[PDB]
Design an enzyme around this catalytic site. Structure first.
Site, short mmCIF file in Angstrom:
data_model
loop_
_atom_site.label_atom_id
_atom_site.label_comp_id
_atom_site.label_asym_id
_atom_site.label_seq_id
_atom_site.Cartn_x
_atom_site.Cartn_y
_atom_site.Cartn_z
N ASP A 140 0.84 -1.18 0.00
CA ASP A 140 0.00 0.00 0.00
C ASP A 140 0.89 1.24 0.00
OD1 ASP A 140 -2.32 1.50 -0.03
OD2 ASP A 140 -2.78 1.23 2.11
N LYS A 143 3.25 2.99 -5.82
CA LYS A 143 2.74 1.99 -6.75
C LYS A 143 3.83 1.50 -7.70
CE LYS A 143 -0.73 3.35 -4.56
NZ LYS A 143 -0.75 2.81 -3.16
N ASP A 168 -3.33 -3.04 -2.60
CA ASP A 168 -4.41 -2.09 -2.75
C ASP A 168 -4.11 -1.09 -3.86
OD1 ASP A 168 -6.83 -0.78 -2.26
OD2 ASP A 168 -5.86 0.65 -0.89
N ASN A 169 -5.18 -0.56 -4.45
CA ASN A 169 -5.12 0.51 -5.43
C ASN A 169 -4.51 0.04 -6.73
OD1 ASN A 169 -6.09 2.60 -3.56
ND2 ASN A 169 -4.06 2.42 -2.58
N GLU A 198 -16.30 5.97 -3.83
CA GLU A 198 -17.52 6.75 -3.97
C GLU A 198 -17.27 8.26 -3.95
OE1 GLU A 198 -20.68 5.93 -1.17
OE2 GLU A 198 -22.12 5.72 -2.82
C1 LIG Z 1 10.28 2.56 -1.28
C2 LIG Z 1 9.27 2.79 -0.17
N1 LIG Z 1 9.20 2.15 1.00
C3 LIG Z 1 8.19 2.51 1.87
C4 LIG Z 1 7.99 1.85 3.23
C5 LIG Z 1 7.40 3.57 1.35
C6 LIG Z 1 6.23 4.32 1.94
C7 LIG Z 1 5.24 5.02 1.20
C8 LIG Z 1 4.39 5.55 2.20
C9 LIG Z 1 3.18 6.44 2.02
C10 LIG Z 1 2.66 6.77 3.39
C11 LIG Z 1 2.08 5.82 1.17
C12 LIG Z 1 3.72 7.71 1.37
C13 LIG Z 1 4.91 8.27 1.85
C14 LIG Z 1 5.45 9.41 1.28
C15 LIG Z 1 4.79 10.00 0.21
C16 LIG Z 1 3.61 9.45 -0.28
C17 LIG Z 1 3.09 8.30 0.30
N2 LIG Z 1 4.91 5.18 3.36
N3 LIG Z 1 5.99 4.46 3.24
S1 LIG Z 1 8.03 3.93 -0.18
#
Ligand SMILES: Cc1nc(C)c(-c2cc(C(C)(C)c3ccccc3)n[nH]2)s1
Ligand SMILES: [Cl-]
Ligand code: NA
EC number: 2.1.1.6
Length: 215
Positions: A140, A143, A168-169, A198
């Site tokens: 999650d 992507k 997800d997504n 929604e």
């Molecule tokens: C290579 C990566 N490892 C991890 C563990 C990642 C990550 C993504 C995320 C969210 C909260 C979705 C996130 C964080 C920053 C910007 C947008 C979104 N938290 N952790 S990315």
């Protein structure tokens, strides 16, 4: 200033009951509907997540992308005693929100938070966190990282036959190559679950892929 994530934690601490994970979920769901944050998780995908955890009863769960801790709370509340959740979060301030969220919920014991990027942390799990294999993985996070981290979880031998990957997504914003891979590979048996968004009025979904062993 007081961030969006702190506002969420704050609301939970006001309106939820400590030690009751379900009231934490209600409070978060209620706030996100009040402020209209397009937060991917609600009751739609929540029911499916709950069902997946119930069917396979994982001893060890890896989550990628903790954010505020909604998903971690939802999953950890169904875990058996002695079972573990490992959640990875790349943003320190989110990691801290998630900590406080799990602590309010009374789930701090089941859950371990790891701050860092997935591709750095995943190869440390066996040695540093005494992991053998994983029973379940919830993806999650970013992507474009779903497919490389799935391949990284294979290479590292963290998946055993029957390990559930839940992503997800996969349709919105979409992980087209990730899907093509797992659906095409004999190493994965795949099921798609639908969830209408929604707020955006468009269909999304979760992909469940069960590792079959190596090709
Ligand atoms: C290579 C990566 N490892 C991890 C563990 C990642 C990550 C993504 C995320 C969210 C909260 C979705 C996130 C964080 C920053 C910007 C947008 C979104 N938290 N952790 S990315
Ligand atoms: Cl969250
Ligand atoms: Na397949």
């Amino acid at each position: 200033g007081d961030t969006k994530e702190q506002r969420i934690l704050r609301y939970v601490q006001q309106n939820a009951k400590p030690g009751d994970p379900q009231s934490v979920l209600e409070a978060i769901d209620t706030y996100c509907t009040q402020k209209e944050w397009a937060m991917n998780v609600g009751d739609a995908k929540g029911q499916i997540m709950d069902a997946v955890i119930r069917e396979y009863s994982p001893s060890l769960v890896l989550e990628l992308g903790a954010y505020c801790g909604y998903s971690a709370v939802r999953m950890a509340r169904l875990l058996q005693p002695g079972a573990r959740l490992l959640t990875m979060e790349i943003n320190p301030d989110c990691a801290a929100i998630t900590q406080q969220m799990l602590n309010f919920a009374g789930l701090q014991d089941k859950v371990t938070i790891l701050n860092g990027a997935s591709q750095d942390l995943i190869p440390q799990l066996k040695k540093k966190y005494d992991v053998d294999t994983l029973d379940m993985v919830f993806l999650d996070h970013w992507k474009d990282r779903y497919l490389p981290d799935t391949l990284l979880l294979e290479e590292c031998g963290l998946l055993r036959k029957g390990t559930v990957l839940l992503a997800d997504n996969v349709i919105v914003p979409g992980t087209p190559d990730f899907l093509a891979y797992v659906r095409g590979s004999s190493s994965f048996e795949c099921t798609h679950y639908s969830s209408y968004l929604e707020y955006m009025k468009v269909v999304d979904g979760l992909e469940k892929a069960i590792y079959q062993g190596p090709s």
